[PDB]
Amino acid sequence: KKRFEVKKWNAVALWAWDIVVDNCAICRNHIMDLCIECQANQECTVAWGVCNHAFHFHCISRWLKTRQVCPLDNREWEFQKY
């Protein structure tokens, strides 16, 4: 017979990905690399989209030179969050 007993509880959570990102899928190097082209010849930053797809700036730029879609989801790519 506890003094107060809990009967209901409407908890609120906030799910987030355990790994935000570990690889730029144009160069197979992690996002904090120089995107291989900058590694050989030496600035280099990451870029994001609406689909939350982090890539190297130079990799996504050279992809967008001839293409206009995100490499992973194959939909229209536009810049968001630098």
Partner 1 sequence: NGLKTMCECMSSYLREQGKALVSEEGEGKNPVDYIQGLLDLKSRFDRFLLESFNNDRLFKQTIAGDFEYFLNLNSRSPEYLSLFIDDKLKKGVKGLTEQEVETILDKAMVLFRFMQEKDVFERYYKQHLARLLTNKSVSDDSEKNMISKLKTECGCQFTSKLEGMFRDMSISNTTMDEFRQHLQATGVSLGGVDLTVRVLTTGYWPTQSATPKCNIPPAPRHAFEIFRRFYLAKHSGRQLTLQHHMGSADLNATTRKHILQVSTFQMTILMLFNNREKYTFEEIQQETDIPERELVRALQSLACGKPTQRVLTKEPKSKEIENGHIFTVNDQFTSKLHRVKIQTVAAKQGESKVDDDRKHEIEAAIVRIMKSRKKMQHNVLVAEVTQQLKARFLPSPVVIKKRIEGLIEREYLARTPEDRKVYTYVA
Partner 2 sequence: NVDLENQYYNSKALKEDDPKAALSSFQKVLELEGEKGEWGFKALKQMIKINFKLTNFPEMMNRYKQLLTYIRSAVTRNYSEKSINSILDYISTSKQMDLLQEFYETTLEALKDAKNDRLWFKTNTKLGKLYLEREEYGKLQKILRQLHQSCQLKKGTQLLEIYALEIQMYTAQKNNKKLKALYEQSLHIKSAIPHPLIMGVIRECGGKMHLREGEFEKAHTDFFEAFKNYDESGSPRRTTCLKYLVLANMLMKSGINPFDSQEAKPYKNDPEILAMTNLVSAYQNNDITEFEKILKTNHSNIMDDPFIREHIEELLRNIRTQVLIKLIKPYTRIHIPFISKELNIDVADVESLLVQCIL
Partner 3 sequence: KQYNVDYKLETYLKIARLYLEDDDPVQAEAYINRASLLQNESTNEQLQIHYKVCYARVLDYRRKFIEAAQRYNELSYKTIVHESERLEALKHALHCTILASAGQQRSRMLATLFKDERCQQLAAYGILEKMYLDR
22 among annotated binding-site residues: no
27 among annotated binding-site residues: yes
Please say whether the beta carbons of 24 and 58 come within 8 A: no
Q: How many whole angstroms separate alpha carbon 25 and alpha carbon 72?
A: 8
Q: How many CB atoms lie within 10 A of CB 11?
A: 4
Q: How many whole angstroms separate alpha carbon 62 and alpha carbon 67?
A: 9
Show the site string, 6-35: x = touches Zn ion by CB under 5 A, - = not. Answer: ------------------x-xx------xx
Among 30, 32, 45, 72, binds partner 1 (CB under 8 A): 45
Q: Which residues are annotated as a binding site?
A: 24, 27, 35, 38, 44, 51, 53, 56, 58-59, 70, 73
Q: Which residues bind partner 3 (CB under 8 A)?
A: 20, 22, 30, 32, 39-40, 42
